[PDB]
């Protein structure tokens, strides 16, 4: 009966000179700490129990107390940064790393989990886990011919802890640690479990959330095709990180973006840009905006795949954040596109929704839309068709909105609107 002990009884048992009494008390603590209703983490810490648990981690001759203390410490470290810090300050990192080699799979699993919480606290504890040498034994746990022979929960916990070692910025993880982990991530990205795939995609998204050199580290491993494939999955927990990673990658160079395009990503965007999940729509439109910011042949790929009508649709009706991303995509398109591509954009019906968005209470989207309109007018000048465009804008109510903006708080807004009026509506 280790259920519902008091902290005082736990302390009494752990302070006894009896390994079995200590084990029973440690299990009682584990059971307190594993209730969903307000576990008494701070009371356990204040009783001074963390150093005892950490020392129990080293009792190789009593594997059960290793396991119970590992679990208790896992749950303490799952709390606030101060509680995780309490676990770290007790010396838990090297003890858990030692436990990674345990012959008992449930114990090494618990150590993996604990290190995942510790590293998940943030950059400093992540890098400290790395400095203590966690990566080699973690990756050794996955050095088997077929991942399918590992227990599903075991593999999921390993994948999750590895993704926390890839997570956070300021600073990003050490480059050598990323290179050490990446091959195993690539292998996990081809495993058939949805949670393993989701967390692998999240790790990749972390590693691609940085400067072009980090993106290049990832892209060099050849994972973009697999990311596109996963972009097509039915499980939303997979699509979300796959799309995040793809978008991060297309914030890179035009060559990295091109690798996304070559893998066939654009063919998925008809569904992504109409996805019933608002966040998928937003992130797909953001990705598109960073593709229409590229080369004219890449804009042309967007055209060929039939995606301009979908951008018109998102501009016409979507969550406002998605509409703002769509306005960005349009401004990038018009800034980089040929005259013919901008003409095509107009023929797909961009003008009316663009104008309708000018009555929004967001200054940035107004600036973006006005820049787009200026680019389109420039193309029209190049064609000698500025009057056609003026009439089109006037017929849908855009001229009223622009003249109203002439008298707007922001400086860039009123300057750009007055310029447009004076230049094309006089």
């Amino acid at each position: 009966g280790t259920v519902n002990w008091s902290v005082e009884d736990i302390v009494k048992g752990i302070n006894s000179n009896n390994l079995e009494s200590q084990l029973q008390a440690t299990q009682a603590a584990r059971k307190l700490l594993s209730r969903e209703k307000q576990p008494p983490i701070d009371n356990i810490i204040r009783a001074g129990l963390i150093p005892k648990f950490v020392s129990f981690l080293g009792k190789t001759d009593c594997s059960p107390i290793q396991f119970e203390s590992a679990w208790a410490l896992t749950n303490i470290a799952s709390g606030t940064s101060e509680q995780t810090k309490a676990v770290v300050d007790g010396g838990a990192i090297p003890a858990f790393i030692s436990l990674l080699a345990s012959p008992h799979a449930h114990i090494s699993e618990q150590a993996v989990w604990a290190l995942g919480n510790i590293a998940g606290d943030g950059s400093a504890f992540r890098d400290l886990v790395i400095k203590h040498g966690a990566i080699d034994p973690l990756l050794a746990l996955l050095a088997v011919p077929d991942l399918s022979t590992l227990a599903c929960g075991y593999l999921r916990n390993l994948t999750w802890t590895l993704s926390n070692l890839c997570r956070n910025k300021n600073p990003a993880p050490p480059l050598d640690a990323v290179e050490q982990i990446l091959p195993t991530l690539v292998r996990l990205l081809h495993h058939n479990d949805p949670e393993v795939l989701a967390d692998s995609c999240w790790a990749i998204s972390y590693l691609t959330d940085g400067p072009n050199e980090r993106i290049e580290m990832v892209v060099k491993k050849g994972v973009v095709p697999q990311l596109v494939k996963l972009l097509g999955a039915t499980e939303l927990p997979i699509v979300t990180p796959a799309l995040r990673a793809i978008g991060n990658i297309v914030t890179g160079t035009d060559e990295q973006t091109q690798k996304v395009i070559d893998a066939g990503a654009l063919a998925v965007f008809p569904s992504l840009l109409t996805n019933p999940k608002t966040n998928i729509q937003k992130e797909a439109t953001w990705t598109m905006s960073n593709i229409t910011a590229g080369r004219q042949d890449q804009i042309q790929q967007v055209v060929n795949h039939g995606l301009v009508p979908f951008l018109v649709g998102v501009l016409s009706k979507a969550d406002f954040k998605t509409q703002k991303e769509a306005a960005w995509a349009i401004t990038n398109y018009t800034s980089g596109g040929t005259v013919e591509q901008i003409v095509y954009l107009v023929h797909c019906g961009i003008i009316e929704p663009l104008m309708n968005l000018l009555s929004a209470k967001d200054t940035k989207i107004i600036q973006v839309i006005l820049d787009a309109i200026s680019n389109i007018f420039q193309a029209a000048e190049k064609l000698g068709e500025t009057e056609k465009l003026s009439i089109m804008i006037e017929e849908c109510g855009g001229l009223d909105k622009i003249e109203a903006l002439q008298r707007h708080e922001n400086e860039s807004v009123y300057k750009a609107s007055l310029n447009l009026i004076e230049k094309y509506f006089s």
């Binding site: 594993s34 209730r35 576990p39 896992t74 470290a77 799952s78 989990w113 995942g116």
Partner: peptide, 8 residues
């Protein structure tokens, strides 16, 4: 995903 998770 969650930064940390307890075992329940």
């Amino acid at each position: 995903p969650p930064t940390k998770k307890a075992r329940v």
